[PDB]
Amino acid sequence: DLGTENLYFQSMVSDFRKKKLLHVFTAFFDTNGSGTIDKKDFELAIERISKSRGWSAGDAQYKEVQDTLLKVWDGLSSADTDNDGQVSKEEWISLWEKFSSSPSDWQNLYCKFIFQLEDASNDGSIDSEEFSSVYASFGLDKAEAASAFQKLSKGKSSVSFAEFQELFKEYFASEDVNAPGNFVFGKTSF
Ligand SMILES: [Ca+2]
């Protein structure tokens, strides 16, 4: 599929930003790897993310994942897509390219979802161990996630919810290859 390489998308987003945005599509949202996001991906994610944290249906935390992710899908699917209930990679780029000027509720809610998996006690901040534990549960290398935290945090011992939200915005927006927000999804390369 060369759609994402067409001149419209190259004028909208740099190659570097496009790679970052599509990484979130493939590594976090397109659970079955089909190349399109649909509700089935969220129904698989609910079960899999819950199990990755040691939860099972009937647990209060499972119900929280379920309710939150189904709300993220409700919002993501309410976008004007070619096919109802399916989100292409080309649609995804459009949805994230202006997150800094026009953030949508589903996008804020996903940011909160990840942060709240990490800050399980609601302290309002995360540390390296919590960050790396959650990305290890998502199947990423734990030591690389701890390295990512060091860069994300710019030396801080803990990162507040507001600082994480701003780092999340910087992941999608920044043109700088060393921007701290690049590291918010647990990797040190791009
Ligand atoms: Ca899919």
Side-chain angles (χ1 to χ4, degrees), residues 30 32-38 41:
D30 180 24
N32 75 346
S34 69
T36 297
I37 299 163
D38 60 15
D41 290 307

Side-chain angles (χ1 to χ4, degrees), residues 9 15 30 34 43 51-52 56 59 62-63 75 78 80 87 91 98 106-107 124-125 129 131 174 184 190:
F9 289 113
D15 291 358
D30 180 24
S34 69
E43 299 285 22
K51 283 197 280 199
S52 79
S56 65
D59 294 342
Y62 185 106
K63 177 155 170 260
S78 287
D80 268 357
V87 182
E91 289 159 343
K98 44 182 207 301
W106 64 270
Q107 301 170 130
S125 295
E129 184 52 43
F131 180 90
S174 188
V184 77
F190 316 115

Side-chain angles (χ1 to χ4, degrees), residues 119-182:
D119 182 23
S121 301
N122 297 310
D123 293 342
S125 295
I126 58 168
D127 71 358
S128 179
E129 184 52 43
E130 291 167 332
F131 180 90
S132 67
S133 167
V134 164
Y135 285 124
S137 288
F138 276 88
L140 287 65
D141 183 80
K142 190 177 168 77
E144 180 171 332
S147 179
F149 185 88
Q150 269 255 341
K151 302 173 175 192
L152 181 71
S153 72
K154 283 219 94 56
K156 293 180 288 289
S157 55
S158 56
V159 171
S160 69
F161 180 43
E163 284 166 337
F164 185 89
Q165 292 167 262
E166 291 298 312
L167 290 158
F168 185 94
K169 180 177 67 180
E170 175 178 75
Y171 178 88
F172 297 97
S174 188
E175 300 288 14
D176 296 327
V177 296
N178 299 134
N182 293 343

